[PDB]
């Protein structure tokens, strides 16, 4: 009876083997499918140029991340470009929209930039003074600056400035422009008579102001604006437009919601009250001839 009982196993041992041979062949096929990395949803586009307009001019048709290398810069760096249906390419250098990024930073972080760049432009960030200075001071060609605000109701305004520019670190990345070009958000950069004093308007204008951080005061105040308000900005004594301020949820805050009592929110006086912090903010530049030529 053993003849069958013993030969029964042989038919199985040799069965398992041929199966193993085939199983190892499939394990090989699987390996071929597990060599690539996870696919990253954020991609940087191939096209590059001096600025975002140079890139649009070359044919780029979608907003996102591109490398730019301003005429005199040592290296290329990443920026978010806004390319519209009309071939206009804006280089965005500031963005607020949810208060996830802390804008209370030092001189170097404002110089080098901070925050994150996203393809869909849904992140907060500060490009960096050095990069803004490099872009805006390339070979003669005036840039135009556009401010874009949005309240907590869905309303939005804008404010343009001709011949926008930001100087080198030696001059504290001073801010300059030739004049207000227009916009329904108002020209807050020219100051705003807050009422508390007649000289308010004069002391709260920004054209000509150097940049200031808490650890590097270059304002026209004997105190420290940047430090008191918790931001980086072209402070006077102190400000009228303050896009790098504290992100107050809802838009409305009071002298009580602030540490020093000073309105340090995302403000733009000529359009809203100092006690109303914007919901979204965006500062971007483009060659001037591009703005309705």
């Amino acid at each position: 009876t053993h003849d069958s009982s013993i030969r029964y196993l042989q038919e199985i041992y040799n069965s398992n083997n041929q199966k193993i041979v085939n199983l190892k062949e499939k394990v090989a096929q699987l390996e071929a499918q597990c060599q690539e990395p996870c696919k990253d949803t954020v991609q940087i586009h191939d096209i590059t140029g001096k600025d975002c307009q140079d890139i649009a001019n070359k044919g780029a048709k979608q907003s996102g991340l591109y490398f730019i290398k301003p005429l005199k810069a040592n290296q290329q760096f990443l920026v978010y470009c806004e390319i519209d249906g009309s071939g206009n390419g804006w280089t965005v250098f500031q963005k607020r929209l949810d208060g996830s990024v802390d804008f209370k930073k030092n001189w170097i972080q404002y110089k080098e930039g901070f925050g994150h760049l996203s393809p869909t432009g849904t992140t907060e960030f500060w490009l960096g003074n050095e990069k803004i200075h490099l872009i805006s001071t390339q070979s003669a060609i005036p840039y135009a600056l556009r401010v874009e605000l949005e309240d907590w109701n869905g309303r939005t305004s804008t404010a343009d400035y001709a011949m926008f520019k930001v100087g080198p670190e030696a001059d504290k990345y001073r801010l300059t422009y030739a004049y207000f070009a227009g916009g329904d958000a108002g020209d807050a950069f020219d100051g705003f008579d807050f009422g508390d004093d007649p000289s308010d308007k004069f002391f709260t204008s920004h054209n000509g102001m150097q940049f200031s951080t808490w650890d590097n005061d270059n304002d026209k105040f004997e105190g420290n604006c940047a430090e008191q308000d918790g931001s980086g900005w072209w402070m006077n004594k102190c400000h009228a437009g303050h896009l790098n301020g504290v992100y107050y949820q809802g838009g409305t805050y009071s002298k009580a919601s602030t540490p020093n009592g000073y309105a340090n929110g995302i403000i733009w006086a000529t359009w809203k009250t100092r006690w109303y912090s914007m919901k979204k903010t965006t500062m971007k530049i483009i060659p001037f001839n591009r703005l309705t030529i």
Partner: protein, 298 residues
């Protein structure tokens, strides 16, 4: 003869079932591989030559960053450790789970493979590193910019940790087969790289030194083992791309054994092919965590 055919059958049938189980497991997996895994890594604004320049520029958090060691090539992604030993560490290698295959050919090792970083959940940015090899060209270029230190960390399956620090580390270009060199050691893991396995004697210990060795992959033999049988090669047997001698004291790019302990009869070629560092756990223990980081010296 009696109970003999009783047990001999209780094996063949048991094993025939294990095979079907494996067939199905592999079949399901092949199915999952019709779709890739995905990450979404928004890019920090702050950038620099490497991670030390970023930390100096204000990059304080550990996450993926874009760096440009040189204006020659395009900036590239990397994970920066800004908390360990004063931060500014550029990760060039990392093992933590077994998510990536490291038994790759020469080209992949030259170009880099794996995932640099992943999402920390509820986060637009990738603050967690994945498993990857930066790439030999990039490694070489990074270590040649100026004096470079190397930090190697590991962890066993129980949570104990040790490290190996080398104040000097350089990897030559491809023309010199990415030859390695390390000095100024200090650590608790054992100086496996310069001295070889501590539990070995004379000649046997000497053939496990990695310092001075060239890089090898299963399809490119540059090890210190002179032989004829094409099967007898450190990379083919020990399963990773590495500065193999004859063969190793440390195999950081080895196979990821789950649990730590493994045996020769578990290994594909019967050798200690795990994520090993002999000088701390011997040949048959495979680390739970392993990583190699660099930073300008000073």
């Amino acid at each position: 003869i009696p109970t003999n055919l009783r047990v001999l059958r209780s094996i063949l049938e048991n094993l025939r079932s294990k095979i079907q189980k494996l067939e199905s497991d592999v079949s399901a997996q092949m199915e999952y591989c019709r779709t890739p895994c995905t990450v979404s890594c928004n890019i920090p604004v702050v950038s620099g030559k490497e991670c030390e320049e970023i930390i100096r520029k204000g990059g304080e958090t550990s996450e993926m960053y874009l760096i440009q060691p040189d204006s020659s090539v395009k900036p590239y992604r990397v994970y920066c450790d800004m908390n360990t030993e004063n931060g500014g560490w550029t990760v060039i290698q990392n093992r933590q789970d077994g998510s990536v295959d490291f038994g790759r050919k020469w080209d992949p090792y030259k170009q880099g493979f794996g995932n640099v970083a992943t999402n920390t959940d509820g986060k637009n940015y990738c603050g967690l590193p994945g498993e990857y090899w930066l790439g030999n060209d990039k490694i070489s270029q990074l270590t040649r910019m100026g004096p470079t230190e190397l930090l190697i960390e590991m962890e066993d399956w129980k949570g104990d940790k040790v490290k190996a620090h080398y104040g000097g580390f350089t990897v030559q270009n491809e023309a010199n087969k990415y030859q390695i060199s390390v000095n100024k050691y200090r650590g608790t893991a054992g100086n496996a790289l310069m001295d070889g396995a501590s539990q070995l004697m004379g000649e046997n210990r000497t053939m496990t030194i990695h310092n001075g060795m060239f890089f090898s992959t299963y399809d490119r033999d540059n090890d210190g083992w002179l032989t004829s049988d094409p099967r007898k090669q450190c990379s083919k047997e020990d399963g990773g791309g590495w500065w193999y001698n004859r063969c190793h004291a440390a195999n950081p790019n080895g196979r990821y054994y789950w649990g730590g302990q493994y045996t020769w009869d578990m290994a594909k070629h019967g050798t200690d092919d795990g994520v090993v560092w002999m000088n701390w756990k011997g040949s048959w223990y495979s680390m739970r965590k392993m990583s190699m980081k660099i930073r300008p010296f000073f």
